[PDB]
Design a protein around this ligand. Sequence first.
Ligand SMILES: Cc1cc2nc3c(=O)[nH]c(=O)nc-3n(C[C@H](O)[C@H](O)[C@H](O)COP(=O)(O)OP(=O)(O)OC[C@H]3O[C@@H](n4cnc5c(N)ncnc54)[C@H](O)[C@@H]3O)c2cc1C
Ligand SMILES: Cc1cc2nc3c(=O)[nH]c(=O)nc-3n(C[C@H](O)[C@H](O)[C@H](O)COP(=O)(O)OP(=O)(O)OC[C@H]3O[C@@H](n4cnc5c(N)ncnc54)[C@H](O)[C@@H]3O)c2cc1C
Ligand SMILES: NC(=O)c1ccc[n+]([C@@H]2O[C@H](COP(=O)([O-])OP(=O)(O)OC[C@H]3O[C@@H](n4cnc5c(N)ncnc54)[C@H](O)[C@@H]3O)[C@@H](O)[C@H]2O)c1
Lengths: 328, 323
Amino acid sequence: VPIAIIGTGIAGLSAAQALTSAGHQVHLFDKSRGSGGRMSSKRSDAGSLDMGAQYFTARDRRFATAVKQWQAQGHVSEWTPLLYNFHGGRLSPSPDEQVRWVGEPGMSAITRAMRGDLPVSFSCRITDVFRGEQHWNLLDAESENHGPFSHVIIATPAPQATALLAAAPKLASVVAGVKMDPTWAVALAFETPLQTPMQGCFVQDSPLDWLARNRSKPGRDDTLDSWVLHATSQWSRQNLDASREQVIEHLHGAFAELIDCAMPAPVFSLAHRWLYARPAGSHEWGALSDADLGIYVCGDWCLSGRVEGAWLSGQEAARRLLEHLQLE
Amino acid sequence: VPIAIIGTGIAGLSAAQALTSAGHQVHLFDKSRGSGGRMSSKRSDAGSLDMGAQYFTARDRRFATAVKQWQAQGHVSEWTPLLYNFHGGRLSPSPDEQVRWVGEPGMSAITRAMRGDLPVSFSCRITDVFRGEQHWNLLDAESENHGPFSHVIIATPAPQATALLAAAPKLASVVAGVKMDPTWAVALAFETPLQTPMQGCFVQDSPLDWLARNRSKPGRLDSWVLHATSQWSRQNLDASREQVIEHLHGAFAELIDCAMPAPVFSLAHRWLYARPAGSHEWGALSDADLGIYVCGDWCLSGRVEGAWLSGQEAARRLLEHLQ
Ligand SMILES: Cc1cc2nc3c(=O)[nH]c(=O)nc-3n(C[C@H](O)[C@H](O)[C@H](O)COP(=O)(O)OP(=O)(O)OC[C@H]3O[C@@H](n4cnc5c(N)ncnc54)[C@H](O)[C@@H]3O)c2cc1C
Ligand SMILES: Cc1cc2nc3c(=O)[nH]c(=O)nc-3n(C[C@H](O)[C@H](O)[C@H](O)COP(=O)(O)OP(=O)(O)OC[C@H]3O[C@@H](n4cnc5c(N)ncnc54)[C@H](O)[C@@H]3O)c2cc1C
Ligand SMILES: NC(=O)c1ccc[n+]([C@@H]2O[C@H](COP(=O)([O-])OP(=O)(O)OC[C@H]3O[C@@H](n4cnc5c(N)ncnc54)[C@H](O)[C@@H]3O)[C@@H](O)[C@H]2O)c1
């Protein structure tokens, strides 16, 4: 009887890896058509786009060790863009010297490799998690039952987890208090490359706080010069219900204010709203659990709100489950 | 810019009635193909079956007037069944002078009439509720946006409300604490009427705690609706429909006091969040400054009356705040 994992972002897949390494079968669920969550890459008319996390850093040694394995396997590489800063309405080079990692050929490659051939049900939105006398069961949005499962790991943003925790109301109440902040992201592509050496920019005093040039990322070689623009959470909140076209227009404007070359009209534009982009604050929980009941909860919001945090959180959920088994 | 109401059970529709009576536009949402929620009737080979709420009492003077209005409209009538008890393993009559009401021709008639031609989006599961600087917005399970809305009323079972309250995490945490119990229901119909005078029964010491005979209701094959206890329903929460029918049919066959042949049709329905485990005294929950309101039976007594009163209270708080 396998363990159900709801969510195939890096937290859920990190838990899946740990459990399967320890000799336990899992079954993965995601409402999306594929895995990766906020690390996903989007195929588009302008090539593959990373519209969520663009890169990540690694400080914790356990996570850094995993990243170096992924690198050896060809799924991640360092990204060292020629960076600029825009502050006080002025553009300047930024000798930032920080190691940043990017999935290759796209950010989604990391989680795709973690998932491997583990059993998975995509386009399967779980709406209820409930237990009988012996086993756990999942109900999906089409009213189909899934189970039996021996345990459940919920690996979703906290607001999306609360509805799945009716069986564990003390946990549900904790999870319901975890605030996550929104982000609007925009992608623009140009038929000919912009005539600038800029490959990324940190932005202040602007609707934007970050932008990146996709062709500068390792293994990227799309004919179209695509750029991904990230709005601040404050701007995104203020504009949370703006239309996609207005968001595109405004962040395009912010980009045009800082750029150091001519910018023709884009041939493609996309906006994406992440309602629950990152946690508003940090925790040191690692995971949340009711091991006696058999329910575990994980995600970036259990720790630092970054890819590293999500991965560590999944490791911790799995560790607790495995410890409980070993003890039983 | 209208008010969004998520949930078209009697709580949501009660809120809708109060708001539209006061001249405010609404838009209704439900994940189901129709309205009524836990009062809904199931169409079947034996006529409309009330698989959910079976009858209701009207004690509160305001609700009683509403019930009298519905009666005037031909949507409800008094139900005066010959009631029994199954106690100590024996069936005996249990008379009482309690007035009970039923929708006619089915329990669903009440909410259908409340809904009328109000704007509604069915097969529309709301997954997210969020606000900009001036308006509310809804996202559904197909990733389609809905809005702008001036306010939002959530009118769902409490565990289903928690996901819709991210914008109001203090309310979400309260709502997350509300326990609701499950109920399995089974319907059986017989080609010839069972030779018993019983028309309903309160049942003890059984998987069942209630059974009712539909042809005994005003305006309605001899079909019977069986309701399992919350304990039994919990113990069997992940049983198949076929297993539940088999087991609850067996339980009915154990208590009946006349010959009972094989039924010509059977149906089962699992209500995961059938009723609140306990009582509450909230009336409604709200953050009026934010513009979000929450209602449902679980805000009061866990009965039709409680749902109706809760919707009225949510609407009243909204209307009071508009000022
Ligand atoms: C715009 C943006 C920029 C970012 N930049 C950075 C950065 O520079 N550095 C960094 O370290 N991090 C960054 N992040 C954060 C990083 O993306 C996240 O911390 C991490 O990816 C979260 O992983 P997770 O597994 O916890 O959740 P997610 O990736 O959100 O995975 C949750 C999964 O659960 C699924 N799901 C949800 N509800 C259900 C349901 N009911 N049924 C089935 N499936 C469900 C979802 O579809 C999703 O696939 C960024 C995020 C965003 C959005
Ligand atoms: C088996 C059973 C027997 C009962 N018997 C009796 C009785 O004899 N007497 C009595 O007084 N009461 C009885 N009740 C209780 C009565 O049915 C309820 O108190 C009442 O109908 C609840 O109304 P409500 O509007 O609060 O919720 P509901 O009727 O549950 O309506 C909620 C609505 O919200 C919708 N919804 C939920 N989530 C979403 C979403 N995310 N997006 C869109 N729509 C959504 C649902 O589809 C549903 O239509 C019984 C209930 C059950 C289950
Ligand atoms: N199936 C479910 O899970 C569920 C969910 C929500 C509400 N409800 C029902 O709401 C119903 C209505 O409660 P109410 O107070 O409005 O109506 P009511 O006064 O008819 O019923 C209340 C309770 O009183 C008892 N009772 C009343 N008359 C009786 C008699 N003649 N013999 C034996 N017992 C008798 C029963 O135990 C009954 O459950 C309850 O009966 C309850 O079953 C059921």
